[PDB]
Amino acid sequence: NEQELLELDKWASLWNWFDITNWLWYIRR
Amino acid sequence: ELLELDKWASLWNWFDITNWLWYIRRR
Amino acid sequence: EVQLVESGGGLVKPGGSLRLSCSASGFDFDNAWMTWVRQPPGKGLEWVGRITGPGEGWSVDYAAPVEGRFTISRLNSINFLYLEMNNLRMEDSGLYFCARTGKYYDFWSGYPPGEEYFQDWGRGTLVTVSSASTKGPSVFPLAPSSKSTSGGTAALGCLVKDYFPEPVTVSWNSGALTSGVHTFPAVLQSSGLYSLSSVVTVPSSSLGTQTYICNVNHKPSNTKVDKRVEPKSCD
Amino acid sequence: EVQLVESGGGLVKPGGSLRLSCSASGFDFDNAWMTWVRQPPGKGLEWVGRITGPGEGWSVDYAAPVEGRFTISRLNSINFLYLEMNNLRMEDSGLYFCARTGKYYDFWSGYPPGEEYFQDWGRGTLVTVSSASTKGPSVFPLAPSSKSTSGGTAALGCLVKDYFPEPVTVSWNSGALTSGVHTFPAVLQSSGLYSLSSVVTVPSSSLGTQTYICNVNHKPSNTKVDKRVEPK
Amino acid sequence: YELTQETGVSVALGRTVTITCRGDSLRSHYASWYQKKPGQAPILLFYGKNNRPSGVPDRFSGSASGNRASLTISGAQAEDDAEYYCSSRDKSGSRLSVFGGGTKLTVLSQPKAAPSVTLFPPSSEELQANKATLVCLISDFYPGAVTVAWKADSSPVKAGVETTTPSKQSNNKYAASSYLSLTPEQWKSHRSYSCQVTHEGSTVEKTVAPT
Amino acid sequence: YELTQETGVSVALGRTVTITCRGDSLRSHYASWYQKKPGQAPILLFYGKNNRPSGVPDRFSGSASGNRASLTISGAQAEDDAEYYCSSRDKSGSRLSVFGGGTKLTVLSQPKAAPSVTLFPPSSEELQANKATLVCLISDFYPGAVTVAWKADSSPVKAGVETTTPSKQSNNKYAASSYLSLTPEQWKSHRSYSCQVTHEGSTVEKTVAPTE
Question: What is the CATH number of the domain that holds C62?
Fold first, then answer.
């Protein structure tokens, strides 16, 4: 369980948070 | 002059006074 | 017009020393004989000693229990009498008075050195000789409510708790309130500590909108308390 | 499990430099965003800066008053965060915390770049910037007497006078005595020097029997003082 | 013990009474007489062969014969209820002086008056200091004798009570105070506490409640 | 001051209180909330839309509307007495963060308690160092607000005085300390010095003299 979340976070960390958030915002609007 | 005489009277020893008053009555 | 005011009393340890003072006015101090008298707790008056005048060379006589430990002296330029006490012991404890001393001798029936009488007295100063430590008071309100009102008048006060030694003084609104004041004699507790209550009677209609502050002074601990007394919220 | 421990704080002159460290454990440090926050004396928390992660190429952002003078970096192999401070100023003086930093973005209502928040904190390390110099404390007894007693119990203490900079720590009888103890916050005199007091209340009957010594530690001046406190 | 006085003397209001002082020195020396009320400076009443100070009511008069000296009060008043001390030389011809052990003069009867009783609960501050004191104040009664009992919810309290011995007030009626020490928990866990003051067969009970 | 919070709010034990954070950025960004007690690291209470970390009691919750974020405590406990800070972006879409100025939350959880005051004169040891400090220690009072004033004889003392902010004892009552720093000559030249402590309308004064 908890391990799956940590592993997941390790994957997301590969991306640029500032860019990710910009793109999510465009996707929404 | 009784003014200065009261001054001096104040330097009378009470114990001497009473001893003397007693003496003149008793003798 | 004769006024005598003793001071210098307080707590001293067995073996200690203390100087008492007595200021005098309203008479010819310089030529006056002056006497110290004490009242031990629960006892009667006790002659301590007397100092004489210029004609006697400021001679002093002392009570036996006090000989060689106490010294009575005077400073005429300021009209002060003093009692210096050394090697104090518990039995020294009491209320100390100073007294303007008259001299009387009946010519026809008298015997030297006649007798001395105490024409004016001070209110005394309290000396406590004890190994126990001084303790300052805790002051708590005695709050008025519907259980201490009496129609147009209400009683409120201050509990002055757990102090040592005596005395404490209490006033109300810095002595601006004199009428209505009742300070009860202290109780002596099993702890050796004193407690006392002081109350003032005030107009009931004034409760909650006017200020009542008891001023408590306990010189032996160098403590003063000004305690505000209010009707308690909602009780 | 998460532990954060800052060090390297001390006294430094205006214009000087300093390097703070924070060692982290109990979480994936390599991927964690890390933030420095400071609390100046008498004031609140202030954000200083934050270093991001591998995804962001370890970019760093800095608060405006600090930009161009401070540098945040990290060493992932040894799990350390660092704050290098140059050209230090009096207003930089204060308590520096490192914080494990999380990221939040609400897909439906959020606005880029979402929010950062501080999930775990160190105890902080104290920075003092001043042209004043170190001074070790003068420790004085607060003795018991007739002026300082009340029935059965008695209050005694130590006055820790005129030291610089903070902090001082105090114990009583080598730590054994902890019941009845209160150590006050320091005051800052117009002299620029600190003082504080520590007091303890004890049975009056215990003086003949028990000895009372306060242990004062002032690391900034390399001073320790074991001070006996005896009745007048 | 050079001068000896009656330890106590009672007299009807408005009647005549004589207090006496006796000792070897009195056959040679006159006595002087002092009134003393607890809390108050003593007052010289009479001295020598026949000297009554200005201000002293004419009902006080002193006399002497053999080794005795007497203070006589005629038409004794309620405010004459006090202690009385004689003073003289300790021995014939001595420079020292001494007082007798004093006499308590009780000026008996007069009207009975019921106590005013007021009871205060513990303050919050005191409760916060981990103590609780109930304070029962009693005043304006005569004669100077009361009994005080305390209750907790109708049950008699039998510890923690301290009561003063009654003292004269400036109106010559009496006042006393009684204190009940409780723990805060004892005070808060009862519906009420009462102070019960019995005087001359009658009882006044005042009650306070933590609520 | 991009984010503003109340300076101080008080709430009765077991009642409900809301403190707020205000700023333009909050229109666009959520706030996070931190509890901070003196000499202790801050703790995260709540963040984002509706996120309370594990370990935080459910009586804490945040909300948001317009340019305001709010932290609500439903049923305030004594231990909630603390400073609270909010944090968010300084501007909409900024990569920087900022904190509000902080709110001091007073939970009144006890009846009034009167201060115990002790005044210590300068120790011989200190007078030997050519210094003199009067130390006035105040304790066991509640709530934690006092006024301390000093007298030389009967005269108020302006300078030389420093007083700490009351701080909590082990028993949740407060204590404080006040110092009057004198020169030895000053100390020996007056009959007495006094520390006067006023708390909730009532005053305790302790006095010491240069003799004994």
Answer: 2.60.40.10
